[PDB]
Design a protein around this ligand. Structure first.
Ligand code: CLA
Ligand code: CLA
Ligand code: CLA
Ligand code: CLA
Ligand code: CLA
Ligand code: CLA
Ligand code: CLA
Ligand code: CLA
Ligand code: CLA
Ligand code: LHG
Lengths: 66, 40, 85, 721, 151, 146
């Protein structure tokens, strides 16, 4: 367990973090990638802290499989 | 309560009548099975 | 037929006379079960006769159970109701 | 007519009585109020669910008190699955036969026994509880319908929110439903069955709940369960692979799919339906407008397309009912062809009597529902199609080139019919004239199905190559050199495909295409035709429009369902026949000590199913001997029902080959005899309507025909298997 | 939109069912402290069995309670009851007079703090549940063990 | 003879239009309505009466086992004479069914006690069935312990 544990439990909480980056987008206020990433992408983004731990465990499951 | 009676007085009447008839016939057959004739 | 032996003594005297004091006609002026109230004089016993005791109490020792803040201050007791680690 | 006041009015003829039931569920003919209809059908579904729930309660109850399931559990190989017992009245007790386990009952084919073993059920106590729980649910469902029609009926707006309904049904019902069942498997089904396969005996198995509470009992086998923290939160997931696998194939001891695989299956299915559940738009932003997306698809060929669909499928039940019936029926068919090839239950494949009847039952249910899609699709055209308010454009064009689609489909059927049935008439003629070299056979001019043979070949070489994780094949019909033998019976085996298999598939291509033709012609030409420009004003269910134009009989869309109904019978009836003979001839049989396999009919399918005479002799005449010699035995009822079906069938031809004009005139003479003796009913006797006589005709035809095979099959496999 | 009603109503939408919410504000309260009372009165100095079978008490737990909790609705459904000394002139939401001795005292609201004491005692007593269930140990063991080894 | 005051079975409220307290013993009871037709009630009434009168006597059968803590030709004749006798008896009673303010009290009270025996006479047997034990002693014999 110990530190190692807290390092996987944080990367199964950072498996989350990488689909933050898709889409992260930024450009705040310029250019527009944020507003664009808040236009159609996202109707909030802890809905994507939540869309995170869902598909992220899948992305790891598939990146090992792909 | 007039209503329930009528309700029981439609084609259901037929089922109740035929159920009662069947029960009679079967029970008759229990007491007197394999009857090929009337011997009395 | 029906009076015969008090209806077999109310019948129900047959399967259960509830509790008839055992050690009968001895130290009886007490109670059913007999977690003995006993005679009257000396301790009642059926621990009971611990009674509050001192350290190294008996219950029925395997090693564990619970119990008390004896002597001068032992609670929370390490054995029971205490933080574990 | 209770439903309508004028309809209720009064009875003057007997026709009123027949009409009363005919339009009992015709909710859209009682009101024009969409909300009232929707409220009606929604409650009706509750009443349905209650009946099937009650149905389930009786299956579990009978399994508990009137079955030898426990007896079958210890010795599944040669104990006959039997539920329900017959009272000893007027000679009935003969139907109670030797089924093993010191029990007298009728052998069953529902397959509940195989289901119950898979669920890990061990005692009548457990079956007894499940029966009560079902009854309790039946009480709820019935009550729920009364509450949502008289107390609190939903608005039309409620039903129209299809997005919210979609998200739930394929996630709340499908996803969690699959997930919930996935849990029972690895906690109850898998542990208990693992014991059962070790010959531990049911009473010597610990109770299911002891497996859940303490990990100790469940952990000694499948040691991945040992870790309390579990490797799930470590997200390695490799450790779990002991209780679930991608092994596939078939367990050589129980003859069913590894529960080790089905648990993993549902685990995947669950979240796959949980993710796909998060698609459509609701209230908290994230999601899709199905209205929007549908609009987006358009084309050089379709012009505007799908625009307006959302309006149609949110205001017309018959439109939704047709789509659902078309695929729910199609789903039932693929269920039949997936459960035979991949036996998912313990000691299921071994039980030949159950498999034949399961495949055959699903084929009819699937076949009927698809025909029903034709009806409501046609009903939609007559009752709900309005271009002024709800134009689609997709629908247009289709109507625009409808004379094209039918004419082509007309041709394909003729091409198929010749190139299917004709080959058989060829073989029947060449063999009769004493020239088998000439026939379309494996021994002569052969027409090998190399395409199907090639797809099977790649399925065999799939594990390891294009399927690394797969240790074995998907189904053993794609195996290659594998052979599973549970008991002295063969569970499954690679199924060969020859010239005899080329012909029969082309017959199914045919029968399905013709069935499609009849039904599709009735839907497109439901409103207008060159013959009848205003058919839509005559309605969906009308007999005709007179002897004019040479004769316009059965121009209604109703009658197209009527004609296509016989063809759906003709169709399936030959699918199930293909299944029966092929499985008996080249799959089912007994395996010896040396490994030699003897099939029931002994591989006579390949060279005798290429002839018509061959089906009439080697199949019908041969395999009938059971049903026609079942008198004085436990299968006595099948012999009677075989004769009983042949009658209700020939009884239909009376209605189908004649018309009501004769009958009404006959009644006139009979009414006279009554009036002479003061015994004339005030409710004047009338003949059946022109359309009813067709409805009466096809029902009895299907009943007598279907029922007649039912007795055919069930007498055959029981006496032999 | 879970909140917005618009019903006749079969009671998922209109006003009650938050009415009940008000009153389980009280026996999740009496239930809680009344359940810790045997727990820590013994602090100083799983079937489990008491007297007969407690299903028999039940018949008398759902008996009197019946004769009791019944009427209570009666008032609601319609002001009077009238069967016995019994007076219940108070409003359906609350009937303080006659069963509260001498006091009469409601507006601060306290009621807002009594519903506040309410649904914290809900989650307090909802604590007790999942607490001693999925773990296998009571609410006070793991709690004491939780301030013991936080991380 | 109408009043909203009658001690209803379920307080606030219980008023079926058919029942009104005009009858004796009217505690306002009949959700089912098992008699909403006057032909329906007038018959039920007599029915609910004769029963009670009988049940009382049945009770008078529970009176005899405490006085002490079946025929000269068992059944058969004993019944036919009974059939033949109570027949004629009940016979005329049938023909009559189809062809002071003080008295109300008596009759209201008569029904209620009568109602008691039936519930009573009932109770003593569905406690006797499945459970072979007499009720003779049970009053303070079962009061020893639940
Ligand atoms: C609790 C008792 C109860 C009572 C007194 C009523 C009374 C009424 N209902 Mg309600 N209903 C109930 C329960 C009840 N219902 C339940 C539990 C449901 C949910 C399924 C419904 C759903 C319902 C609908 C949708 C409608 C009514 C309507 C009506 C009114 C007309 C009756 C009628 O439809 O014609 C006929 C009476 C029948 C009893 C028809 C028989 C139907 C039953 C369910 C058949 C049982 C299935 C059977 C076992 C199938 C196997 C047969 C097999 C032997 C071959 C009438 C006031 C109608 C209305 O309001 O008028 C406009 C109406 O639209 N009811
Ligand atoms: C529902 C949660 C869930 C869980 C706990 C598992 C767990 C497991 N899977 Mg499954 N899987 C799932 C869903 C899940 N899967 C879904 C939705 C699919 C798509 C159909 C798959 C497709 C799949 C394949 C093809 C394989 C596994 C395999 C495995 C095992 C090895 C894990 C591995 O090596 O990398 C994980 C591989 C993945 C594809 C992970 C994807 C799963 C995430 C949750 C999707 C979101 C492991 C027990 C392997 C196995 O069975 O051993 C022989 C294997 O080959 N899985
Ligand atoms: C998804 C299921 C489903 C639902 C909800 C409906 C609903 C409806 N249908 Mg549809 N139908 C379906 C499937 C369905 N159907 C399928 C699969 C087919 C193809 C066979 C049809 C063919 C069809 C036709 C031709 C018609 C309908 C019609 C109707 C409407 C009213 C008719 C009615 O009240 O029934 C009346 C019920 C009877 C007359 C009972 C008949 C007796 C049955 C058929 C005997 C069954 C034999 C039994 C199973 C075994 C023998 C038992 C016996 C020996 C005791 C109603 C909206 C009618 C309509 O006009 O639409 C508005 C219409 O004419 N349907
Ligand atoms: C809905 C589907 C269904 C079907 C087709 C049957 C069919 C049957 N039942 Mg089952 N039953 C069911 C549901 C069903 N039951 C449910 C849900 C329960 C739980 C309450 C039962 C409880 C039950 C018992 C206790 C018995 C049957 C019996 C029977 C058989 C005798 C027929 C009969 O009852 O006499 C006529 C029915 C009446 C006169 C009353 C109406 C018959 C095969 C009997 C049997 O199995 O014979 C040995 C039997 O004793 N059933
Ligand atoms: C997510 C939870 C959920 C579940 C489990 C269901 C389940 C069902 N729905 Mg419902 N539905 C839901 C959400 C849900 N729905 C929502 C949010 C809406 C609003 C848009 C609807 C609107 C809706 C309509 C209009 C209809 C249904 C119908 C049905 C039944 C169809 C029968 C079936 O699918 O197979 C399997 C059936 C079962 C497994 C029985 C499940 C037992 C109960 C019902 C589950 C209770 C949930 C419990 C707390 C866990 C089925 C009981 C149809 C129906 O049958 O009418 C009554 C119907 O017409 N649903
Ligand atoms: C076109 C036909 C076809 C089909 C229907 C499949 C189907 C499948 N493949 Mg295969 N695959 C194919 C062609 C195909 N493959 C080819 C041409 C190659 C060579 C590049 C592969 C290499 C391959 C690998 C390495 C794996 C699969 C796996 C899988 C399974 C899981 C797929 C998944 O993870 O999520 C959807 C699935 C049964 C996985 C598996 O074996 O499951 C256990 C797996 O890891 N496939
Ligand atoms: C097997 C099929 C069949 C059967 C059983 C019949 C039977 C009959 N035909 Mg018919 N007919 C048929 C085919 C059949 N036909 C065909 C293919 C055609 C060419 C289109 C005709 C053309 C035809 C004509 C032109 C006439 C008949 C007439 C008759 C009746 C003659 C009276 C009689 O002898 O006995 C009486 C009845 C029977 C022997 C059979 C009744 C069925 C059983 C015995 C009734 C018992 C029901 C039982 C309780 C089951 C209940 C079911 C349950 C769901 C309720 C009789 C009903 C004539 C007629 O109507 O005379 C009055 C007449 O005019 N037929
Ligand atoms: C809110 C109302 C309420 C109240 C006032 C009580 C009160 C009580 N409960 Mg109940 N309880 C309630 C609600 C309530 N409960 C609810 C809602 C539930 C369902 C969850 C329960 C379930 C429950 C159980 C299972 C039990 C109780 C028990 C008790 C009693 C505690 C005795 C004990 O063993 O603990 C501690 C011991 C004491 C308090 C004794 C104190 C002795 C003092 C320190 C002096 C010692 C000297 C000694 C007696 C010598 C005599 C000298 C003399 C002069 C003093 C106490 C009377 C227990 C019981 O019934 O007792 C047999 C018990 O087992 N309750
Ligand atoms: C001719 C045949 C005949 C028949 C079948 C009857 C039948 C009956 N009579 Mg009648 N009676 C008859 C002739 C007949 N009587 C004649 C000729 C006279 C003289 C006018 C009477 C004078 C008469 C009187 C005064 C009474 C009867 C009564 C009765 C009923 C008494 C039932 C009973 O409990 O006894 C035995 C029951 C069973 C055996 C069962 C019975 C229906 C009694 C009556 O009306 O009951 C309501 C009644 O009081 N009868
Ligand atoms: C020899 C072996 C090689 C195989 C090739 C030959 C076998 C396949 C038959 C060729 C059919 C061509 C399909 C073109 C692909 C195709 O369908 O294109 C679809 C095409 C696309 O239209 P759009 O681009 O507008 O579509 C988008 C919008 O229209 C919708 O929003 O629409 C049409 O073609 C309209 C006319 C219908 C065309 C009717 C022909 C139907 C063929 C009937 C046979 C069905 C066979 C199914 C078997 C499973």
């Amino acid at each position: 367990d110990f530190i190692g544990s807290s390092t996987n439990v944080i990367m199964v909480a950072s498996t989350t973090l990488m689909l933050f980056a898709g889409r992260f987008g930024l450009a705040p206020s310029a250019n527009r990638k944020a507003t664009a990433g808040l236009k159609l992408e996202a109707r909030g983004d802890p809905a994507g802290f939540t869309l995170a731990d869902t598909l992220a465990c899948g992305t790891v499951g598939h990146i090992i499989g792909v | 309560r007039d209503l329930k009676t009528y309700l029981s007085v439609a084609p259901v009447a037929s089922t109740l009548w035929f159920a009662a008839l069947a029960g009679l016939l079967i029970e008759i057959n229990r007491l007197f099975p394999d009857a090929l004739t009337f011997p009395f | 037929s029906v009076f015969d032996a008090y209806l077999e003594k109310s019948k129900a005297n047959k399967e259960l006379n509830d509790k008839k004091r055992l050690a009968t006609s001895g130290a009886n002026f007490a109670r059913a079960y007999t977690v003995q109230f006993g005679t009257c004089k000396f301790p009642e016993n059926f621990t009971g006769c611990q009674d509050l005791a001192k350290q190294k109490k008996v219950p029925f020792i395997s090693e564990d159970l619970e119990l008390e803040c004896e002597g001068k201050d032992k609670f929370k007791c390490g054995s029971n109701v205490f933080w574990k680690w | 007519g209770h439903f309508s006041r004028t309809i209720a009015k009064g009875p003057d003829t007997t026709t009123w009585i027949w009409n009363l039931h005919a339009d009992a569920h015709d909710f859209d003919s009682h009101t024009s109020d969409l909300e009232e209809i929707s409220r009606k059908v929604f409650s009706a579904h509750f009443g349905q669910l209650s009946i099937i729930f009650l149905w389930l309660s009786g299956m579990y109850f009978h399994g508990a008190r009137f079955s030898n399931y426990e007896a079958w559990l210890n010795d599944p190989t040669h104990i006959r699955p039997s539920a329900q017992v017959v009272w000893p009245i007027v000679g009935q007790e003969i139907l109670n036969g030797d089924v093993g386990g010191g029990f007298r009952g009728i052998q069953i084919t529902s397959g509940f026994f195989q289901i119950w073993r898979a669920s890990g059920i061990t005692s009548e106590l457990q079956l007894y509880c499940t029966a009560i729980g079902a009854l309790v649910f039946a009480g709820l469902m019935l009550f729920a319908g009364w509450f949502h029609y008289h107390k609190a009926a939903p608005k039309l707006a409620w039903f129209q929110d299809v997005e919210s309904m979609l998200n739930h049904h394929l996630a709340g019902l499908l996803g969690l439903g699959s997930l919930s069942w996935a849990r029972h498997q690895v906690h109850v089904s898998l542990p208990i069955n693992q014991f059962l396969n070790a010959g531990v005996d049911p009473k010597e198995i610990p109770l299911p709940h002891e497996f859940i509470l303490n990990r100790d009992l469940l952990a000694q086998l499948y040691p991945s369960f040992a870790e309390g923290a579990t490797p799930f939160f470590t997200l390695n997931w490799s450790k779990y692979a002991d209780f679930l696998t991608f092994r596939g194939g078939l367990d050589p001891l129980t003859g069913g799919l590894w529960l080790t695989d089905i648990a993993h299956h549902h685990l995947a299915i669950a979240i796959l339906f949980l993710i796909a559940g998060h698609m459509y738009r609701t209230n908290w932003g994230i999601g899709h407008g199905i209205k929007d997306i549908l609009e987006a698809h358009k084309g050089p060929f379709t012009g505007q397309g799908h625009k307006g669909l959302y309006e149609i499928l949110t205001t017309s039940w018959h439109a939704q009912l047709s789509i659902n019936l078309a695929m729910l029926g199609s789903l039932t068919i693929v269920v039949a062809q997936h459960m035979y090839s991949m036996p998912p239950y313990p000691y299921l494949a071994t039980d030949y009597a159950t498999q034949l009847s399961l495949f055959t039952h699903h084929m009819w249910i699937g076949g009927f529902l698809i025909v029903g899609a034709a009806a409501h699709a046609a009903i939609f055209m007559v009752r709900d199609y309005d271009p002024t308010t709800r134009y689609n454009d997709l629908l247009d064009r289709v109507l625009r080139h409808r004379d094209a689609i039918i004419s082509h489909l007309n041709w394909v059927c003729i091409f198929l019919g010749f190139h299917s049935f004709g080959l058989y008439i060829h073989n029947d003629t060449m063999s009769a004239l004493g020239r088998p070299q000439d026939m379309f056979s494996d021994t002569a001019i052969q027409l090998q199905p190399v395409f199907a043979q090639w797809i099977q070949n790649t399925h065999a070489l799939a594990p390891g190559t294009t399927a690394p994780g797969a240790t074995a094949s998907t189904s053993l019909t794609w195996g290659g050199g594998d052979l599973v033998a549970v008991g002295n019976k063969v569970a499954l085996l690679p199924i060969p495909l020859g010239t005899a298999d080329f012909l029969v598939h082309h017959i199914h291509a045919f029968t399905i295409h013709v069935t499609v033709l009849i039904l599709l012609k009735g839907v497109l030409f439901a409103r207008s035709s060159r013959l009848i420009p205003d058919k839509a004003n005559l309605g969906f269910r009308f007999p005709c429009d007179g002897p004019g134009r040479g004769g316009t009989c059965q121009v209604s869309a109703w009658d197209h369902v009527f004609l296509g109904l016989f063809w759906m019978y003709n169709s399936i009836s030959v699918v199930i026949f293909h299944f029966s003979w092929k499985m008996q001839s080249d799959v089912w049989g007994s395996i010896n000590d040396q490994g030699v396999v003897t099939h029931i009919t002994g591989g006579n399918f390949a060279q005798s199913s290429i002839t018509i005479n061959g089906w009439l002799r080697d199949f019908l005449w041969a395999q009938a001997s059971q049903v026609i010699q079942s008198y004085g035995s436990s299968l006595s009822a099948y012999g009677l029902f075989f004769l009983g079906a042949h009658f209700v069938w020939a009884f239909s031809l009376m209605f189908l080959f004649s018309g009501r004009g004769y009958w009404q005139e006959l009644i006139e003479s009979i009414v006279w005899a009554h009036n002479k003796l003061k015994v004339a009913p005030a409710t004047q006797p009338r003949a059946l309507s022109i359309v009813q006589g067709r409805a009466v005709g096809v029902t009895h035809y299907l009943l007598g025909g279907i029922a007649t095979t039912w007795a055919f099959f069930l007498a055959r496999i029981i006496a032999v298997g | 939109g879970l909140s917005d009603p618009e019903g006749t109503g079969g009671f998922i939408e209109p006003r009650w069912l938050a009415y009940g919410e008000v009153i389980n504000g009280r026996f999740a309260m009496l239930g809680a402290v009344g359940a810790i009372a045997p727990e820590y009165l013994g602090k100083v100095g799983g079937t489990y069995n008491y007297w007969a079978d407690n299903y028999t008490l039940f018949v008398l737990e759902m008996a009197l309670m019946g004769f009791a909790e019944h009427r209570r609705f009666q008032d609601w459904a319609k002001p009077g009851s009238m069967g016995k000394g019994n007076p219940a002139y108070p409003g359906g939401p609350f009937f303080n007079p006659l069963g509260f001795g001498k006091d009469e005292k409601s507006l601060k609201e306290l009621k807002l703090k009594e519903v506040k004491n309410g649904r914290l005692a809900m989650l307090a007593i909802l604590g007790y549940f999942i607490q001693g269930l999925v773990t296998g140990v009571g609410p006070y063991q793991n709690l004491l063990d939780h301030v013991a080894d936080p991380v | 003879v109408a009043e909203p005051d009658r001690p209803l079975w379920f307080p606030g409220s219980t008023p079926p239009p058919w029942l009104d307290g005009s009858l004796p013993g009217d505690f306002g009871f009949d959700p089912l309505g098992l008699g909403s037709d006057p032909e329906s009630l007038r018959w039920n009434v007599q029915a609910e009466l004769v029963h009670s009168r009988w049940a009382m006597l049945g009770a008078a059968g529970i009176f005899i086992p405490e006085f002490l803590t079946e025929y000269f030709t068992d059944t058969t004749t004993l019944f036919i004479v009974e059939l033949v006798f109570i027949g004629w008896a009940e016979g005329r009673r049938w023909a009559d069914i189809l062809n002071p303010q003080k008295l109300k009290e008596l009759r209201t009270k008569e029904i209620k006690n009568g109602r008691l025996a039936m519930l009573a006479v009932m109770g003593a047997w569905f406690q006797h069935i499945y459970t072979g034990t007499g009720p003779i002693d049970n009053l303070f014999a079962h009061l020893a312990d639940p």
